[PDB]
Every structure is written in C-alpha cells, then in structure tokens.
From a paper:
This membrane protein is an orthologue of the Escherichia coli intramembrane protease RseP that belongs to the site-2 protease family (Hizukuri et al., 2017; hereafter, E. coli RseP and the A. aeolicus orthologue are referred to as EcRseP and AaRseP, respectively). The high-affinity NZ-1 monoclonal antibody was established by immunizing rats with a tetradecapeptide (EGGVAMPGAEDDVV) from the platelet-aggregation-stimulating domain of human podoplanin.
The insertion site for PDZ tandem (181-PA14-184) was chosen because this loop projects into solvent, but the context and orientation of the insertion site will be unknown in many practical applications of this method. To determine whether the PA14 tag could be inserted into a more sterically hindered site, we selected the βD–βE loop as the insertion site. We assigned two complexes (referred to as complex 1 and 2) in the asymmetric unit by molecular replacement, but the electron densities for the PDZ-N domains were too weak to assign reliable models for this domain in either of the two complexes. In contrast, the two residues were largely separated from the NZ-1 light chain in complex 2, although they were still located inside the antigen-binding pocket. In complex 2, the PDZ-C domain closely contacted the neighboring Fab, resulting in a rigid-body reorientation of the PDZ-C domain relative to the complex-forming NZ-1 Fab. Despite the different interaction modes with the NZ-1 Fab, the main-chain structures of the PDZ-C domains in both complexes were consistent with that in the structure of the wild-type PDZ tandem without the PA14 insertion.
Residue numbers in the entry:
A (entry chain A): 207 to 235, 235A, 235B, 235C, 235D, 235E, 235F, 235G, ...
B (entry chain H): 20 to 149, 158 to 236
C (entry chain L): 20 to 233
C-alpha cells in the first residue's frame, strides 16, 4: 500500500501543529534540539508501508518527532509531541488516513 | 560490531603541535558526526570539538581559542584533531566519540597527549619468573602509557596490569598473568610491551630461569 | 553556557537503591536532553542512559533516568545496586555548547571482606647484569582498600629504595604493587627479604631469598 493522509482529528497534535490532509509522508525522525555536530545524524526511518509510521510512533515513546512530508509537491518538515492517551495510554497524533 | 581506534598521541613540547587520528569502522561513517573529548583527573571531562556528518559544519569548545581544527577523511573512515600552540594545561587523555543526535553512543579506547619539555624515555623490560603466575616488568619509562599483552592477546583472562609508580621522573610498573602450570609446561609464553611515546614494542619469552 | 553540578562521591550499600543527581545552573533542564555515562577505573566511558530516560541495549533494567523540573535536576536511579557498579558516573547535556558534570564517584560498601593474595618475584639475571635489582611484590584480591606496605631484610624494616603504588580497582577487586630499588650487591648481601602487608589489622607476608633448595 501507500501512506497517505486523509483525516485530522481536530485539536489533536497534528491539528495543533498544522498538518492538513492529503499529504505524502516520507520520513519520521527524532525531534528536539540536537547537540552541536550531530544535527545531520540519521536516526529516523524513511517510511513507505504505513505501518512503519505507526511502528515509529510507538518508538516515539511520547518524545518529540519530526515528519518530512509533501505539500502539493514541495518538501516540508513539521515536528510535534505525541500525547499520552487517558484511556489505554497510547501515544497519538490524530492522523486518519 | 563497532570499533573506534585512536592513534597519534604521545609527548610534545610546549608551543608545538600534534595531530591525532581516530580510525572508525563497523558503521556507516558518513551517516554520523564525530567528536573529540578530553579528560583529566583535575578538570574532569571537557568537550573539545565536533564535526558534522557531512564535514561542512564544525564546532569548537571554549577550552581552545581556535588553536585546534577538526577534519574527517571519509574514504579512510577516519577523523583528525590538529592541535596547535599546545600548552602544559592541554595535557590529557583524548577520546574520540561517535554521535547520535543527542549523546555520545560509542567512545574510543583513548590516547594520551603529554605536554612536557622532558625527553621521551623508553622502558627497560625485564622478565619476572618465580597453577603458576608469570610476569613482565616495565622499568623506568616516561611518559605514560604502556600496554602489555600476553601471547599477542591470546591470553586475555587472568591478566593484571598494575598501576605504575613514579619516582625521579620515571614510571615503573609490573604486569602479571596466571596460567595453569600445564600451560607453562608447553606452548611458549611471551609478554608484549608497547610504549607508544617511544614507538617501541618488545616481546619477552618468560623462561623458567 | 551552563554548568552541571554532581556530588563528588556517593556511598551506598550492596542491594540498595541509589539516586545520583545532576543540577543545571542556568536555563530550564527540560530544554535539552540529559545523558548518563558509566566509566570504570582506567577504562573508557560507556552509556548508561541517553535521551533523559532511554536504556541502551546491554544495560541492566535496574538503571532508570528521570527529569525533575522543580529542582532543575536530572536523576540516575540504580535499583538493587551491585558491586560491579562501582564506577564514575558523569551526566551530560548541551545547548550552544557541550557540558559535562564534574563526575560522581560511587562507592558501595558491604561487599565481602577479602584477605589479600601475595605474589613475589626476585630480580632477573638480565637486570643484575646492569648491577641493579628490583624486588616486586604484587598484592591482589583484597578488600577494603587501605594497606600499609613494609619491607623487611633479615626482619629489619627498610625504607630507602621502596616505592609502593596506591591500590587500584581492576575488575571486581583491588590490586597494588611495590618495588625495591637495590644495587646488585645489596641484593646479594642478605639471605632474606620480606614483603609485609598489613590489612584490617591482619598481616600477611612472604619472603624471598638468594638461595636454592637442593
């Protein structure tokens, strides 16, 4: 399959950030300020199978992440914090496909 | 398996220069930045320099006022610290360390830089003969460090290399290994002494003299 | 830009929980990641904790990290502390520069008393050819770490020419060494030298003699 954005839960992390539907998500990487000399270190993963996304959301462990994605063809990077759910306690962003 | 093997240390006079090397392997070199960090007993850990994965961004710590420059040779999977205008206070053990965005994930074994106008002095090595315990004696060297192995590292368990004493400006230490007497009764046993600052390496077979 | 302050030393007990603190002098601690490194005596550092609270694979799960923003401090917690945990621990963070704490030395009392093992070696013929003689006394497998080292010749205390190293930990226990600088003639003169070590009020000694049983 292919990982495409469809729905955005209002008020959820991505909604507070600015993710709009219909985006192609390429990469998910570690977030937060990096130490000098290590900005270009690769820790993230270039995604394609949509489950690689949700896998890399469980790896997030509630820590901030960057998303390198496509807006009508141009590359754009947005970073956010997955929120701890008050029910079963799972990190979410609010990103329906 | 990840390996960071440092070389290029030793003794240098105040006001001179020394270049250090860190040979990397066991991971994609060009995917990660590298750094140099020094250590002393009195000042603890002090960050020295970092260089980015693409070699195009460099970062210097405020312990060195631009006197050091960092470089990386991606074809040799190595990186370098050029240390100019060296000072007594720059004497330290220098480590290279691989980065992963937010921390130093692996450290090299360390190499020692000593800033001193005393000459390098090579050790005199003597064999110490009486299960069984055998030893190698590294008498009267300067500066630190020395390395001792047994049978080129094929004897690794049972080895003790003892901290040196310092007297009249020269270090002396002893290293020992314990083996079954049946071991001593067969294959030759040799200690291997390396003094990086004099670039010397000695093997001594321990004979039941 | 900021400094990280660590205690000089902490002493705890085998099996206890112990918390090591790391306080940031200026700027909110949560504004950048904190990491923790373990360094054994004479060895390279290894990672205990990175990214505030993640545990590298290979590290026992009795280590955990946390961030206390109210005290602007990072915390390394060790549950069920073990004697193999004696080591130096450095905290680490960064912003525009990279900053280390001054290091905390962790001592764990309460491990088993260890009476020393003694190994002694005479001078080599090769060294005597140069008219010198060095007597070697190796002291290992002892705990705790204070020792008084004394040498005897024919039972009388000898001070001149003695160099004794401070004990050091290697692996799980402590080691020490002592050297006697002699001339070839001083070594040939008496028919006994003794390395004497006193430990926890108990004394162990072994002697060396220029003779031969035959």
């Amino acid at each position: 399959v292919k990982p495409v954005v469809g729905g955005v839960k209002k008020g959820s992390p991505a909604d507070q950030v600015g993710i709009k539907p219909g985006d192609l998500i390429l990469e998910v990487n570690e977030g937060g300020v990096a130490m000098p000399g290590a900005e270009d270190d690769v820790v993230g993963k270039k995604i394609n199978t949509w489950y690689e996304l949700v896998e890399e959301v469980r790896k997030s462990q509630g820590k901030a992440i960057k998303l390198k994605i496509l807006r009508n063809g141009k590359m754009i990077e947005k970073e956010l914090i997955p929120a701890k759910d008050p029910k079963t306690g799972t990190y979410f962003i609010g990103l329906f496909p | 398996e990840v390996q960071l093997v440092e070389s290029g240390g030793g003794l240098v006079q105040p006001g001179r220069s020394l270049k250090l090397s860190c040979a990397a392997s066991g991971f994609t070199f060009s995917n990660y930045g590298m750094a140099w960090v020094r250590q002393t007993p009195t000042k603890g850990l002090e960050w020295i320099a970092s260089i980015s994965a693409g070699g195009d961004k460099t970062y210097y710590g405020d312990s060195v006022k631009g006197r050091f420059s960092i470089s990386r040779d991606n074809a040799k999977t190595t990186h370098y610290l050029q240390m100019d205008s060296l000072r007594s206070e720059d004497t330290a053990t220098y480590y290279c360390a691989k980065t992963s965005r937010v921390y130093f994930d692996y450290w090299g074994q360390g190499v020692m830089v000593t800033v001193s106008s005393a000459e390098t002095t090579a050790p005199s090595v003597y064999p110490l003969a009486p299960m069984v315990t055998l030893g190698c004696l590294v008498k009267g060297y300067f500066p630190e460090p020395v390395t001792v192995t047994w049978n080129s590292g094929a004897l690794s368990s049972g080895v003790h290399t003892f901290p040196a004493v310092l007297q009249s400006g020269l270090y002396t230490l002893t290293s020992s290994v314990t083996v079954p007497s049946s071991t001593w009764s067969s294959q030759a046993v040799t200690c291997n002494v390396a003094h990086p600052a004099s670039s010397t390496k000695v093997d001594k077979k321990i004979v039941p003299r | 830009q900021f400094v990280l302050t660590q205690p000089n030393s902490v002493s705890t007990n085998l099996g206890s929980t112990v918390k090591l603190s790391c306080k940031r002098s200026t700027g909110n601690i949560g504004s950048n990641y904190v990491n923790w490194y373990q360094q054994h005596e004479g060895r390279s550092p290894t990672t205990m904790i990175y990214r505030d609270d993640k545990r590298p694979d290979g590290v026992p799960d009795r280590f955990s990290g946390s961030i206390d923003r109210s005290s602007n401090s990072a915390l390394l917690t060790i549950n069920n502390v073990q004697t193999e945990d004696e080591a130096d621990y450095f905290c680490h963070s960064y912003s525009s520069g990279i900053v280390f704490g001054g290091g905390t030395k962790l001592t764990v009392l309460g491990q088993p008393k260890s009476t020393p093992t003694l190994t002694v070696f005479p001078p080599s013929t090769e060294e005597l050819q140069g008219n010198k003689a060095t007597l070697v006394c190796l002291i290992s497998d002892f705990y705790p770490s204070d020792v008084e080292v004394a040498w005897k010749a024919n039972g009388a205390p000898i001070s001149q020419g003695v160099d004794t190293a401070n004990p050091t930990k290697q692996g799980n226990k402590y080691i020490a060494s002592s050297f006697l600088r002699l001339t070839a003639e001083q070594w040939r003169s008496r028919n006994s030298f003794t390395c004497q070590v006193t430990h926890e009020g108990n004394t162990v000694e072994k002697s060396l003699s220029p003779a031969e049983c035959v």
